[PDB]
Amino acid sequence: MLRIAKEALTFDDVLLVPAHSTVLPNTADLRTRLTKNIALNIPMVSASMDTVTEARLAIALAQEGGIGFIHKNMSIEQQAAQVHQVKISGGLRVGAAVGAAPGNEERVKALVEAGVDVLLIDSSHGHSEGVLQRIRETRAAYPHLEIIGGNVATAEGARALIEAGVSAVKVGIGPGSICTTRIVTGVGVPQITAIADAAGVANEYGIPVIADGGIRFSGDISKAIAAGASCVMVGSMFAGTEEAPGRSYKAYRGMGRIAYKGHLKEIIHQQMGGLRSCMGLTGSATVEDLRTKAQFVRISGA
Amino acid sequence: MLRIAKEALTFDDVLLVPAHSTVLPNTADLRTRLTKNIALNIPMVSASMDTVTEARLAIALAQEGGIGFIHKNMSIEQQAAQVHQVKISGGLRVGAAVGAAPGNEERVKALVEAGVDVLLIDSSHGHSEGVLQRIRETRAAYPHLEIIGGNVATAEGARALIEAGVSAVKVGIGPGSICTTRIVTGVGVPQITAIADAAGVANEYGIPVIADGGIRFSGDISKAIAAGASCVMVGSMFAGTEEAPGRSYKAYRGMGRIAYKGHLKEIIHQQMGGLRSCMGLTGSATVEDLRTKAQFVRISGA
Amino acid sequence: MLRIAKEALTFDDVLLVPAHSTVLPNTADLRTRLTKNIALNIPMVSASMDTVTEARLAIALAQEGGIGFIHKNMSIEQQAAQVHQVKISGGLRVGAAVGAAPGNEERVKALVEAGVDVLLIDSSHGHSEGVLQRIRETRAAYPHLEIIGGNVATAEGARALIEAGVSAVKVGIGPGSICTTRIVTGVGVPQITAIADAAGVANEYGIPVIADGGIRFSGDISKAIAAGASCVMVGSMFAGTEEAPGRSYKAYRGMGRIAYKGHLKEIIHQQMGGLRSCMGLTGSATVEDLRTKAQFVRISGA
Amino acid sequence: MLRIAKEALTFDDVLLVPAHSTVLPNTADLRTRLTKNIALNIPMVSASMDTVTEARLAIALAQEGGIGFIHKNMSIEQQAAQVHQVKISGGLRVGAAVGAAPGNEERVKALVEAGVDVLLIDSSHGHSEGVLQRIRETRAAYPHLEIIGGNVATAEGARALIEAGVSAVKVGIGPGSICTTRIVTGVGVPQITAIADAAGVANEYGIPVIADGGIRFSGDISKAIAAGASCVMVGSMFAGTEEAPGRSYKAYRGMGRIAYKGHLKEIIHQQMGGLRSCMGLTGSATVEDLRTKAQFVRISGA
Numbered sequence A, B, C, D: 001m002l003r004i005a006k007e008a009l010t011f012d013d014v015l016l017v018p019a020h021s022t023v024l025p026n027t028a029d030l031r032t033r034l035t036k037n038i039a040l041n042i043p044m045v046s047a048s049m050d051t052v053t054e055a056r057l058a059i060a061l062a063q064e065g066g067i068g069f070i071h072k073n074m075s076i077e078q079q080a081a082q083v084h085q086v087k088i089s090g091g092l093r094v095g096a097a098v099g100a101a102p103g104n105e106e107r108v109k110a111l112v113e114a115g116v117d118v119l120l121i122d123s124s125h126g127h128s129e130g131v132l133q134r135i136r137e138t139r140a141a142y143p144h145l146e147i148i149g150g151n152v153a154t155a156e157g158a159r160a161l162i163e164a165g166v167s168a169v170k171v172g173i174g175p176g177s178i179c180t181t182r183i184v185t186g187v188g189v190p191q192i193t194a195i196a197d198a199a200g201v202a203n204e205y206g207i208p209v210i211a212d213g214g215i216r217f218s219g220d221i222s223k224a225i226a227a228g229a230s231c232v233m234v235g236s237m238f239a240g241t242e243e244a245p246g247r248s249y250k251a252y253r254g255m256g257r258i259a260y261k262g263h264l265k266e267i268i269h270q271q272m273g274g275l276r277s278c279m280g281l282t283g284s285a286t287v288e289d290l291r292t293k294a295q296f297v298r299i300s301g302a
Ligand SMILES: O=c1[nH]c(=O)c2[nH+]cn([C@@H]3O[C@H](COP(=O)(O)O)[C@@H](O)[C@H]3O)c2[nH]1
Pocket: A047, A048, A151, A172, A174, A175, A176, A177, A178, A179, A180, A181, A182, A212, A213, A214, A215, A233, A234, A235, A236, A237, A253, A254, A255
């Protein structure tokens, strides 16, 4: 009667199962892929948000083995110069975001001319035909440009993005800490099922999946990876750091205030320490082992 | 052993699934049906409550494309005059409510003579034989009058109302924000299952279903429609507005105080903006697409 | 692997389903049975607790159509005299409780000689052999005495009580508002499943089931009856009334303080008004209709 | 798609079912086994934590019929002397913990020479090859030494420990009140399923299982035993007692403050009183009856 496609699971619905292990946390290999052709030293990227990622944060994150996505709420001169700034600070990679509306061609051109490593075409709805069309137009114009498209939350959405020409699929409709999509629209898919459904398709093509939204604790990063993600995208977790664009707070807002957190490097150290522990507990030598072989148990939340 | 008919779902048990879309929010078509023969420009109607709907609110809502139901807790002169007031403010439609007890014939006659577009026969229990009898008596007396009957929460209740002669079925036993039915009586059906069960029957006859109770957020409106409703009836959401009959509050009570909310037009704008977004995300060009083709996922609430 | 007998449901797991009805709340028939041979005008009895039932409350409740159980924490003279007090206030019925330990014979004799209508043999564990033995000894000694035995929470426990000679089975292990059994012992059965399992057996013999514990709201009374109970036993709900043995409170304690509630008659009126409403909504003309024909839906608690 | 091994249950997901009983709480037999060759008078052991167990607590617990595990965060002289202290206070048994890193041989030798009854090889991950290797090395060196290995949370982990030479398997990954494993790593198994899976294997060899972590209330002890554990290990429950190493608190920290609790003997008395009650309710004459024959119901947590 009611058209229910299936049950869907979020981070708090599952735990990872410990397994025989020869991995110690300090020996775990955190290397992974952002896109088909771009490797990362750690599985973390920053959100393309005007309170999270500008050049300073992008530099800090790349030095720690991640990549930042310069947000689009700035002029092209400003966004190209930020790209260039990162590129000259010693062979660092950088991304930049553009919207999916028509008229973005000059922004894309400037970013590409500035040496951007990866273009993110950011949308609240990656399965929208206008998004697919922007990706197809960009891929035709720039046959060798690494392109992330998103966000999707289904197998069919991931397949559509891949067939539009993306280099990586970004997943997340509903899960972000801002919570407006779900409440305002009634649309979303719990993020563990969303990642798995997208990865089920993406794996067939060797296309990485990026898990975007809902990461609160380092345990969520492990679960996101085990569900099939190659890396995670975080906004709230890095907002309020020194590097982000009677107590001290910084603005965090949807594209609210967050308590000051100090320097990004310590946050990243704590988060990856958790991941390293999980890899020791699950016997995962590499991110790929975690992503393809670790097992979950479903829990009640009692 | 225990006589359990089935499991039943409420709004918080489900999310809508994003889908391929050529719909933009500004292009979504919000037109729908209130009854077999009455169209609405937006899928919203107001509750027949003495703290929610009198002439002023009914006028404001009709100007925005909805319809109001003038409550019955007033004399006939008063209720007929309120009907007339709305009708003369420029070709606006209006409803009015009457109780299901015997002796309502003169009230119904006066409302009909005042030009009421739709008569609501309101009951806490639409599957009661006394209600069915009042609907049958009214339908026989006024063969062409649009009549809403309710409330029901089951397939069998919807079928009984239709067989009594209603023009639309109103659903909701248990879900209203007042919460007394469930707590006091132990009776109710979670509203997403209630809407779907009623729509399963009503669809066979082209009879609209009105989802009444439990709408807190614009996301609930989308879900109600996707479960099979043609429009939603709201009480709490409009109570406390300027138009409803050291902080400022208005009474909201069952047939309690609610913080002042300003003008109805802004509320309606925000609520329909959410619905338009959901339609963009689900690829629903029209209310009918959302109502008949969108899909849900079941969630745990973790 | 894990020895799980089945899933079990409490009051908050279920709702009653509305049904076709010719019953109005004021026409509902609240008569029921306490025991095989004792009728009640309403389905309520009071707990045998030293902060709930002495003669004054027992009188008030019997005048409203219920029956009270004089608690045992008093001497025999005191407990017999309390029995007699109720019996002389105009043809009122009364119960009295005794413990299940050996040595209760003189207490039982005195109660029987005082005219007690029903003897309650009260235990936290009715399936204990010592309890069954006390019931068997009492039944042999007093072949015509109405005897309630309890508490049990299973089919097998109900069958054992019946085979020991009880006139009614009292159900409840775990559900009481005091909550110590569950927390301290880890033992219990959710009360809706407990009632149904016990009634499944008891019905085969025409033996009533009394639902004891966990009743918070009048909705719980309806659900208890629909699960198979003939009446409900309440402690917290009547504790703190005028009649029970800078704000005003009375002691409520396990065999804590409760806010003063005024007179018992108003409480009973409100509780039975809820039940009458439920019977109108479910089309239950009599307690037996509710107990044997009404249907539930299972809910998530979202 | 998603690699989910199964659903898993914690203490709050289940209740024990009452059963026919000839057991009174005062007649229940609390004797059990710690290891293959070490009996206990009550099923309780203390955690090897630097805020829970040193000689004073170990003595007090052994006098009540349990055994304590002297923690390792002290020198060998200190840890051997603490062992000796307990051994001379009148034929008391004592355990001691060592880490699983290489270099522990002299610590183990000193503990064994001091008369330690049981060696605990403590790890957050008992299925780690380094742990299995330390157990195998210890078993080869000390063919007759009772050795506890842990912690594991799976059948396969329990089997690995047994095949490494342990005398008892300790279970718990994720359940401890400190909660860091789950949150930081995303790894864990709900403790009732973890105990049952481990006991399913261990039972085949007559090897006891020790349930470690998550015990808050005496009801949890009963459930842990019924799930298959022979005894429980507690940290938080004994931290803050007089004997543990403007209000009064003691440190409780992971290997935080806890309110002062008075003397250990009263805590143990209350906890075992709950267990005795559960055994009366379930008809379990002995710990083995509870561990192998009692039944659970699954509950929703409403
Ligand atoms: O519900 C939303 N309302 C918004 O206004 C919004 N803006 C961004 N995003 C998305 O949230 C992601 C970051 O989520 P977290 O704060 O949980 O890391 C981001 O990376 C986006 O995918 C939004 N989600």
